[PDB]
């Protein structure tokens, strides 16, 4: 004979505390993407461009053509341009919505030819109560071989 | 000859973003140079560094009164300090002085043994029309010798 639920109740869902049931693989899984990179260096500044490759086949360009990934080196790191991305979300009230975000990738080179850095997501609007929140996601890039013959990369300077 | 008279309402527009300094062979404004006594503590999980600020006239001495110890943490290929919430005076698009809420930090990327990076100032309020503006200032740090004997640095893991 449980005590009856009668009346107004506030229900509080503590999302910041959510956990996954143990599993020996990252949850959510990492996002792995393959890129054909090319670099153009003036004696003033360096730019790199990247064409996205297919996940089922790293020998082929991804179709339809993904916009070329532009990165610029400066102040010790590679950094892409902030992309203004809309983002679905759920507000503190349960109501689904969408919030405005800036996303970029920063990548810092290491001796052996690998890079380490992060993706940075910034929320600019407050539809879901997160205006001003900054999410950082660790990132690793490693060169796994040379350009695939079937794939062009445009000149970064153009 | 005699000029056309100024009579009536006039809008005056001052294009600050286009301000320039009269030529001078030194950076304007001048670089800010500051000296720091650093010490590092690395666990196999994460590394921290702390720094005591040294005196502007005499690099052998701690700056007084004691500046808060400069905390930096290494992660994802760089040294980064914690965002300091700093109020900043400013003038709005209307001329009225005011002050805006800013977040400031320093990021420093190590090089084969110097460091290079930037200070990042973010504006969080809109009293001067700059909410969301991000200012980046290039930064260079170089080790110019050892710890001065007259100067302690706290353990980074303290606090």
Curated annotation (Swiss-Prot), chain A:
Mod. after translation: Autophosphorylated at serine and threonine residues.
Domain of life: Bacteria
Expression induction: Expression decreases during infection of human macrophages.
Loss of function: phenotype: Mutants show increased growth within macrophages and a hypervirulence phenotype in severe combined immunodeficiency mice.
Subcellular location(s) per record: Cytoplasm; Cell membrane
Effect of residue 11 to E/K/G: Results in a conformational transition from dimer to monomer
Protein family (similarity comment): Belongs to the protein kinase superfamily. Ser/Thr protein kinase family.
Function summary: Plays an important role in slowing down the growth of mycobacteria within the infected host. Activates the peroxidase activity of Rv2159c in a phosphorylation independent manner during oxidative stress conditions and thereby maintains the cellular homeostasis.
Subunit and interaction comment: Probably functions as a dimer in the regulation of M.tuberculosis growth. In the absence of stimuli, exists in a monomer-dimer equilibrium: a monomer form with no activity and a domain-swapped dimer form with a basic level of autophosphorylation activity. The presence of stimuli results in a shift in the monomer-dimer equilibrium, leading to the formation of more dimeric PknI. Specifically interacts with two peroxidase proteins, Rv2159c and Rv0148. The PknI-Rv2159c interaction is mediated through phosphorylation independent physical interaction.
Descriptive protein name: Serine/threonine-protein kinase PknI
Organism: Mycobacterium tuberculosis (strain ATCC 25618 / H37Rv)
Section of the entire sequence shown: 403 to 560 of 585
């Amino acid at each position: 004979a449980p005590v009856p639920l009668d009346g107004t109740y506030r229900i509080e869902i503590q999302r910041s505390k959510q956990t996954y049931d143990y599993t020996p693989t990252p949850q959510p899984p990492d996002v792995n993407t393959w890129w054909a990179f090319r670099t153009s260096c003036t004696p003033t500044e360096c730019l790199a461009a990247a064409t996205m490759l297919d996940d089922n086949d790293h020998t082929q360009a991804k179709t339809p053509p993904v916009r070329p990934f532009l990165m610029q080196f400066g102040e010790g790191q590679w950094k892409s341009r902030p992309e203004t991305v809309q983002f679905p979300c759920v507000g503190p009230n349960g109501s689904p919505s969408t919030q405005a975000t800036t996303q970029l990738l920063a990548l810092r080179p290491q001796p052996q030819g690998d890079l380490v850095g992060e993706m940075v997501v910034t929320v600019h609007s407050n539809e879901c109560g997160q205006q001003g929140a900054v999410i950082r996601i660790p990132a690793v890039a490693s060169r796994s071989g040379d350009l695939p013959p079937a794939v062009t990369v445009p000149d970064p300077a153009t």
